[PDB]
Amino acid sequence: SKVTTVVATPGQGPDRPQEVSYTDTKVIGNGSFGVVYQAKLCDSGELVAIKKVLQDKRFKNRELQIMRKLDHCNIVRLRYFFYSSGEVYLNLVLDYVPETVYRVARHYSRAKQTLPVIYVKLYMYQLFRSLAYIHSFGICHRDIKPQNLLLDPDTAVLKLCDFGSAKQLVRGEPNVSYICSRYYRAPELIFGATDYTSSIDVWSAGCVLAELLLGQPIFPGDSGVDQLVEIIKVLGTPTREQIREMNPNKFPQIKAHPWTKVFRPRTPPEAIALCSRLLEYTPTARLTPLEACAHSFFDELRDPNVKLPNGRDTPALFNFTTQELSSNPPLATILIPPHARIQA
Amino acid sequence: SKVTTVVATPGQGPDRPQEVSYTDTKVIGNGSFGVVYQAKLCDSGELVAIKKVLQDKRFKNRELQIMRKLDHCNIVRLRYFFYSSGDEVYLNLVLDYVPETVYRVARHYSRAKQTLPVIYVKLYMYQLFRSLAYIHSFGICHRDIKPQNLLLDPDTAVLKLCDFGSAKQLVRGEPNVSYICSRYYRAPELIFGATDYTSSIDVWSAGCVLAELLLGQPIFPGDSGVDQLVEIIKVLGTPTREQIREMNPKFPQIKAHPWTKVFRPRTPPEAIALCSRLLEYTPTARLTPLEACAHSFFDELRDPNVKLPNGRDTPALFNFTTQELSSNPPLATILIPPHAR
Numbered sequence: 001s002k003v004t005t006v007v008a009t010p011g012q013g014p015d016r017p018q019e020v021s022y023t024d025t026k027v028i029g030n031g032s033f034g035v036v037y038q039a040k041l042c043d044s045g046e047l048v049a050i051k052k053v054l055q056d057k058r059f060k061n062r063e064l065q066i067m068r069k070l071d072h073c074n075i076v077r078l079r080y081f082f083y084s085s086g087e088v089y090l091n092l093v094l095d096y097v098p099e100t101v102y103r104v105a106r107h108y109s110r111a112k113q114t115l116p117v118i119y120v121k122l123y124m125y126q127l128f129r130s131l132a133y134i135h136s137f138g139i140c141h142r143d144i145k146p147q148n149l150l151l152d153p154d155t156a157v158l159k160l161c162d163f164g165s166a167k168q169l170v171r172g173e174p175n176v177s178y179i180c181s182r183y184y185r186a187p188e189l190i191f192g193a194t195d196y197t198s199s200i201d202v203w204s205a206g207c208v209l210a211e212l213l214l215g216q217p218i219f220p221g222d223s224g225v226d227q228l229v230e231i232i233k234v235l236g237t238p239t240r241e242q243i244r245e246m247n248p249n250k251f252p253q254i255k256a257h258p259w260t261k262v263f264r265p266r267t268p269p270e271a272i273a274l275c276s277r278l279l280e281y282t283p284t285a286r287l288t289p290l291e292a293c294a295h296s297f298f299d300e301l302r303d304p305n306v307k308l309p310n311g312r313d314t315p316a317l318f319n320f321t322t323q324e325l326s327s328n329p330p331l332a333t334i335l336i337p338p339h340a341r342i343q344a
Numbered sequence: 345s346k347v348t349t350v351v352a353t354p355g356q357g358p359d360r361p362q363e364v365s366y367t368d369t370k371v372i373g374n375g376s377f378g379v380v381y382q383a384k385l386c387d388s389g390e391l392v393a394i395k396k397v398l399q400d401k402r403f404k405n406r407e408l409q410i411m412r413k414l415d416h417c418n419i420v421r422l423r424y425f426f427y428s429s430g431d432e433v434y435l436n437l438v439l440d441y442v443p444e445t446v447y448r449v450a451r452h453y454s455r456a457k458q459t460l461p462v463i464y465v466k467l468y469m470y471q472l473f474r475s476l477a478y479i480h481s482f483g484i485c486h487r488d489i490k491p492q493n494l495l496l497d498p499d500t501a502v503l504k505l506c507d508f509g510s511a512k513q514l515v516r517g518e519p520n521v522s523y524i525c526s527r528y529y530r531a532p533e534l535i536f537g538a539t540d541y542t543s544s545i546d547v548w549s550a551g552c553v554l555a556e557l558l559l560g561q562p563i564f565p566g567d568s569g570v571d572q573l574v575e576i577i578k579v580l581g582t583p584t585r586e587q588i589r590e591m592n593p594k595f596p597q598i599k600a601h602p603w604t605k606v607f608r609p610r611t612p613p614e615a616i617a618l619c620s621r622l623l624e625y626t627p628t629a630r631l632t633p634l635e636a637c638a639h640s641f642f643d644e645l646r647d648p649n650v651k652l653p654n655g656r657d658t659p660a661l662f663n664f665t666t667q668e669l670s671s672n673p674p675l676a677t678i679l680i681p682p683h684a685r
């Protein structure tokens with residue numbers, strides 16, 4: 001079988017060129033930006049994904065510069081990056097994860113079942129950790145959706161991926177409002193706001209949580225108008241002031257439709273509570289990623305005896321860094337449970 | 345079975361209600377605005393669709409107001425309208441029922457690995473452009489042109505534009521929301537968030553429907569606006585800074601993909617030519633609905649001997665009114681062929 005050898009720059013270490021060899025190359029994605037292949041590293045035999053993008057000589061690649069400064073257990077890792085031609089192409093060698101929340105959720109959905117809540121807790125918590133981390137650098141993902149949430153079935157580790165839309169948001173600087181996928185767009189983006197903040201990622205994460213609980217997207221619609229109608233059916237009509245906070249300079253008025261009426265009976269009240277605090281019209285009213293992690297809905301993950309259904313221990317959930325906690329250090333008293341603090 | 349009698353107001357003419365009875369009611373759709381039922385008029389036996397929408401009684405329904413004013417062979421007709429309740433009040437629009445949609449017809453061919461015969465692409469697109477020329481002559485923009493809102497009668501090949509729930513009279517200098525129009529059919533200026541767009545957004549949408557019928561699939565798919573723009577750039581090429589200015593409100597620099605390379609071989613050159621004149625970055629550069637009708641791609645419909653594959657004659661295609669031609673009267677010399685009475 002064919003073996004390709006390239007010389008690449010390490011994704012995060014010091015600039016020490018490495019000779020990398022991979023085989024069994026095969027396509028696994030064709031997203032507008034470029035091609036996403038899967039390959040097998042000759043030596044270790046580990047699987048990797050290679051995102052190949054056309055590199056504009058005009059400017060430096062934004063995804064690459066962002067990926068180079070990230071190092072977190074819940075963010076897909078950039079192992080190496082090198083250029084080729086076959087025309088100038090940037091290749092990003094990333095860790096390959098077997099599943100996605102999108103595929104897992106679809107499997108349960110067409111089997112008429114919902115994902116056990118223990119998994120909803122583990123997945124959402126890890127997503128909020130990854131967001132707390134990138135937001136601490138002022139970086140907004142801008143495309144949070146089930147397809148960009150990679151999962152390892154056995155360990156239950158979740159990893160945020162695809163930073164092709166990510167960007168450092170600077171106060172006072174305008175940003176395009178046409179990023180983010182259909183069902184997951186915050187109201188301010190639908191209204192065309194250009195001064196939105198990182199809280200749009202929080203709205204998107206809230207849509208993912210509601211979707212895992214419901215078994216289907218919570219705010220579907222092929223047009224922004226249809227999406228807003230679904231949002232209004234649940235949150236109610238926006239006050240003129242809330243519309244002002246979403247920013248952008250006439251819908252059939254409806255009242256506060258209980259969130260308890262939204263999900264099936266049995267749904268943990270804490271899950272419903274969390275959704276209501278994430279999916280808020282006013283962007284400043286939504287919980288921050290870190291506050292979300294500290295929410296009572298995730299208390300079970302902080303119990304000393306918690307275990308995965310398959311018997312294994314839960315993945316690392318409390319190894320927080322100073323960087324991660326910077327938005328609100330005091331939260332550590334809740335985020336790091338007593339038993340994770342025993343010195344032994 | 346069950347018979348329902350209401351006192352309904354005729355869609356057109358003097359506001360004079362009459363008793364109307366209907367039977368065989370059944371849900372046939374669930375839209376965001378409201379349920380859509382089918383029913384049979386007890387007198388005529390004709391089938392009708394009834395759209396029920398919650399009515400904020402302190403204001404006049406815009407869809408109703410626009411519909412009461414429209415009368416065209418290629419626009420679904422508002423037969424009657426009436427109110428009912430469930431302390432909540434509903435406006436019920438009694439519209440003519442049409443058996444098919446371009447969406448369903450196209451899907452049928454698509455999953456059978458075939459494409460709709462071009463004679464139908466011509467008939468359907470021409471009728472859609474006639475309906476657009478008509479509503480635009482009143483300054484009304486549909487704002488949601490897509491396969492699902494194009495009704496079809498299989499036997500006569502008559503097409504009727506429907507669902508005016510997003511339609512609005514566009515007034516120069518007045519701002520309009522940019523979040524109307526469905527995903528694959530949104531003009532670039534809407535994707536960029538323009539608030540001063542014109543009726544030409546309907547033309548871009550119609551161009552997307554034409555390309556889709558020729559291709560067998562949507563031409564500018566994508567779950568985010570960014571993805572949609574990439575697909576648009578792959579075909580039209582990168583927008584000049586000026587074209588971006590005309591659309592109003594950091595992309596790679598790809599060059600124009602020859603339109604002929606876009607469709608399968610065999611595709612009529614005129615079809616390709618029409619698409620390129622509809623799908624233009626600069627909104628003022630796109631053909632007007634009336635100019636589109638007069639395009640050479642539709643010449644076959646103007647041939648005296650044209651017939652539908654099923655042997656029947658084509659539907660009415662030349663009965664233009666002064667209102668319809670107002671944007672450019674001289675086009676009548678092309679629009680109404682010599683043989684046309």
Ligand SMILES: O=C1Cc2c([nH]c3ccc([N+](=O)[O-])cc23)-c2ccccc2N1
Pocket residue numbers: 029036049051094095096097098099100147148150161162163164
């Ligand atoms: O590591 C990957 C690569 C990968 C998947 N989806 C993605 C979306 C975006 C990107 N990306 O690099 O941007 C990679 C991936 C994907 C899909 C199915 C199964 C496994 C899986 N895993």
Ligand SMILES: O=C1Cc2c([nH]c3ccc([N+](=O)[O-])cc23)-c2ccccc2N1
Pocket residue numbers: 380393395439440441442443444445492493495506507508509
């Ligand atoms: O006249 C209708 C009503 C109807 C269809 N689609 C629609 C989309 C919008 C509206 N509307 O009133 O807005 C009515 C309809 C539809 C669908 C399948 C088969 C026939 C058909 N016919």
